[PDB]
Ligand binder design. Structure first.
Ligand code: RIS
Ligand code: RIS
Ligand code: MG
Ligand code: MG
Ligand code: MG
Ligand code: MG
Ligand code: MG
Ligand code: MG
Lengths: 331, 335
């Protein structure tokens, strides 16, 4: 898909950030800050905004530029969340490049989160002249609910669980995942798209596709979690960082009372032994039947969308995310 | 002014906060001591302080258009929103600056760690955002969009002001040291400390249409902002001797710029070489030159220009609010 000239609007997006910086060295700093954190990447979430904006809306106005801007606002929102995540999680690299807090220091990274946010806020606020109040208003409500949940989701990510009390530690996983990841990644860009378009209207037909974004997000984080276990070797990984994650969630689900003991002990000092078990528990295997069932259930759900115009972009959506996750390091 | 009713709204605000945080249905909500984490966060960060800016907004809003009932609570609420804004800004500032105490108590980042401190900042940001969206039902959309525009402008200026505050490259030969500082300070302090609550206050009061010399008020709040920060800086030079402070941190300070207007080529080497290495020695030159001296001259002219400016306000009603403001600020600075 393209998505071109969504990417190419970056140029025009930079100029709008540049002209907002009439306050009146710092411009150069923050222009580079957005180049480092917003320019880099696949831009999946800003891409979800254009897709949904696509069949849903009918060619009338030059809101298209405005839709692209908002597609870059979502990218700055994603970026600022990740610069904040890499600090807490002692991240080393992201998007093939050292984390912003490493190149620029922690104090500047914290302040820079504040920059992107207010930038985000300001570019939104100035979409009133294009879609008017109602649209902007409905867009700002989505924004608030999205990040609010991500923060609480992130809080749960920081809040240590009770490994011994693993009766519904899985219930704590998915809930957390819905909070921290699922919302901003999927709910936010889509609902931002649904608004700009003003699709007409299937409101009662909104929970279904809501259940779609909940699984898309679950699926996204679940695979994120396995990759770390599968390819990260360090003392600043999920296990060495004592984090509630899909492999540990499942392990406690599949393991005898003798292996869950070996994991509770070494979590998390020796990540070595924790993974040893994951292999004898064949977690990797279990994620594959997940990945498998994840796909078709989304198709099940997709096949039920009534609009038949909303189902088109949601057909691309399911594809785009699954291709992201299955066309990885395969071997 | 018997600011007491506002302070007593805290319970309703906290009720309004607890009521929102209903995030999970279906289940018994076994995973919600999250609420008890953040209720504690609010008690720890927003309840403490002395609550100045909050007061400023309520004072303003009520004084240029007094509410009689109902809208008052939405003014009190916002004033508590203001407070949660200032708190989140200072939690971030204390991390960046390695602070130890705030509002009497130990810094939130120390107590709960900086991974949580950063997350908790944007809890308060997002709550404040969603709470300011609350007023829509009471004041209307055009009044909310105006609030939001003020919120944005103000925190955005502070963010770039904090960047200039963190600015690593502060060279030797600097003539713009006073320009870089007073601008820095305009951006990081002047905007949000007194502009934000006063421009919140008088959006809610919505009175009146004075547009021409409504710059005059901005010229007062600026002076008041830098006035407040210049004190903060002096106080740092005077009242601590920790193993590491504002000079151990190469921070652009008031005792540093007005020390580069009076000193000599030779003394401009003492301060330069020992900055971020030995506060004592750097404090001795300050001492020689007597920074607290010319700081007194500063306050005099600062209150002189301030008072003369307030004599020019068009509304004798606003004028008194502004005189009262500056009086409460000057004194409070003198605590
Ligand atoms: O990419 P990362 O850092 O593995 C992660 O997925 C990024 C992230 C941050 C915030 C919300 N959701 C996911 P995390 O959750 O920190 O494991
Ligand atoms: O109270 P502090 O930390 O002395 C200070 O005034 C707090 C502060 C932070 C942000 C804006 N204005 C003041 P700083 O500026 O860090 O010296
Ligand atoms: Mg991470
Ligand atoms: Mg994490
Ligand atoms: Mg991960
Ligand atoms: Mg400080
Ligand atoms: Mg500071
Ligand atoms: Mg200070």
């Amino acid at each position: 898909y393209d998505y071109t000239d969504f990417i190419n609007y970056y140029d025009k997006f930079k100029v709008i950030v540049y002209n907002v910086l009439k306050k009146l060295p710092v411009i150069e700093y923050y222009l580079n800050c957005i180049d480092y954190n917003v320019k880099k990447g696949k831009h999946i979430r800003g891409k979800i905004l254009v897709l949904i904006s696509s069949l849903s809306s009918a060619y009338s106005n030059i809101k298209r530029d405005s839709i692209y801007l908002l597609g870059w606002v979502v990218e700055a929102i994603q970026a600022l969340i990740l610069i904040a995540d890499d600090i807490m999680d002692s991240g080393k690299f992201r998007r093939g490049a050292p984390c912003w807090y490493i190149v620029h220091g922690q104090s500047n990274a914290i302040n820079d989160i504040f920059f992107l946010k207010m930038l985000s806020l300001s570019l939104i606020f100035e979409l009133s002249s294009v879609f008017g109040n109602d649209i902007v208003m409905k867009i700002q409500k989505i924004y608030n609910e999205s990040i609010f949940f991500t923060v609480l989701g992130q809080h749960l990510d920081l809040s240590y669980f009770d490994l011994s009390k693993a009766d519904k530690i899985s219930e704590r996983y998915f809930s957390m995942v819905e909070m921290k990841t699922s919302r901003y990644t999927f709910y936010m860009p889509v609902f931002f798209g649904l608004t700009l378009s003003e699709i007409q209207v299937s409101s009662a037909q909104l929970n279904l596709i809501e259940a779609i974004l909940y699984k898309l997000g679950e699926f996204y984080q679940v695979h994120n979690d396995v990759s770390d276990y599968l390819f990260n070797d360090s003392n600043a990984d999920d296990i060495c960082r004592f984090k509630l994650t899909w492999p540990l969630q499942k392990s406690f689900e599949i393991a005898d009372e003798e292996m869950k003991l070996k994991i509770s002990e070494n979590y998390g000092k020796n990540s070595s032994l924790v993974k040893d078990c994951y292999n004898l528990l064949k977690i990797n295997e279990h994620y594959l039947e997940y990945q498998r069932n994840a796909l078709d259930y989304l198709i099940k759900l997709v096949k039920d969308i009534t609009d038949d115009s909303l189902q088109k972009v949601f057909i691309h959506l399911i594809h785009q995310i699954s291709e992201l996750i299955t066309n990885s390091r395969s071997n």
